[PDB]
């Protein structure tokens with residue numbers, strides 16, 4: 001049967017290490033593919049790492065220029081958890097340079113988008129076969145979440161965006177079932193710009209924390225009702241800003257508007273908004289993608305004055321991070337859903353231009369009801385070795 005979001009989130013008192021692939025360190029002397037925009041996603045019988053290959057190995061001569069985001073040599077690949085994305089173990093879900101993927105309890109739906117900027121197209125795969133196609137509607141880089149979608153009784157909402165990344169754009173929430181379109185709605189609510197949403201599901205509701213790439217340093221949020229197939233949007237009210245780059249934390253945040261200070265830029269991120277059991281993720285640095293920390297900010301979503309009450313560093317401010325998204329093992333034993341997340345640890349350009357490539361490795365953590373001691377998890381690769 002299709003999976004149903006019948007549980008609530010487990011109580012988040014800290015974070016335990018879930019998975020790490022040390023891909024760059026290993027790829028230094030093995031056939032590991034160059035990737036970026038990775039995530040984690042589970043099936044009823046296993047969980048896997050996901051990412052957008054660049055169609056070449058790190059050591060390969062074609063790794064030169066992989067700082068680019070959209071080429072005809074990219075594809076959404078998945079591989080064994082904590083293993084590295086190698087040529088020999090990576091499974092291709094579909095061809096394209098923007099994606100999302102999730103299992104509905106019976107089988108898996110995967111979405112890849114490809115094509116020129118003014119004419120991209122999305123192909124929705126289900127049970128590994130192509131089923132539905134959707135052409136651009138704004139003729140400007142049709143794109144998706146870059147992390148797993150979430151399903152409820154067969155219905156799997158997916159947030160897309162087409163248009164300018166630096167101003168008003170055309171965002172849509174598609175409601176799929178068995179890879180077929182049941183309905184779609186244009187974005188509503190007060191979120192003024194949407195991109196790369198990180199979502200999770202609990203108690204028949206789907207929360208997506210996204211990125212306002214044009215004006216908000218606070219992160220927009222879309223909560224979706226998968227049964228009525230309706231949604232609303234707002235901004236995380238809390239003054240604890242979580243995008244990047246971003247201005248310094250104020251004492252009051254903004255609920256229905258973007259907090260200003262930085263324009264046309266950002267990073268994919270996520271949060272878990274569950275009343276007092278709310279945790280936010282953010283790079284430690286306000287100017288670059290360095291370091292990563294989790295911050296317990298009770299009622300962040302609705303309290304425009306909520307400040308940290310607990311925290312945990314995931315990556316030190318002297319190590320590179322990157323995209324970060326949410327996922328959960330909706331098929332684990334237990335009474336509650338265990339909040340998990342991954343952090344893309346970017347290596348190479350533009351920050352490390354001694355090499356001509358841009359890749360990353362993965363770190364993943366899930367929550368614990370215990371108050372576990374913390375440690376930091378850097379990529380671990382030594383750039384000098386690639387010289």
Ligand SMILES: COC(=O)[C@@H]1C[C@H](C(=O)O)N[C@H]1[C@H](CC(C)C)NC(C)=O
Pocket residue numbers: 037052069070097098141143146165195213266267268
């Ligand atoms: C797959 O590439 C990404 O995720 C890239 C990565 C890059 C970043 O922020 O690091 N910007 C994304 C770019 C953002 C758009 C809104 C301009 N998306 C696409 C599909 O080109």
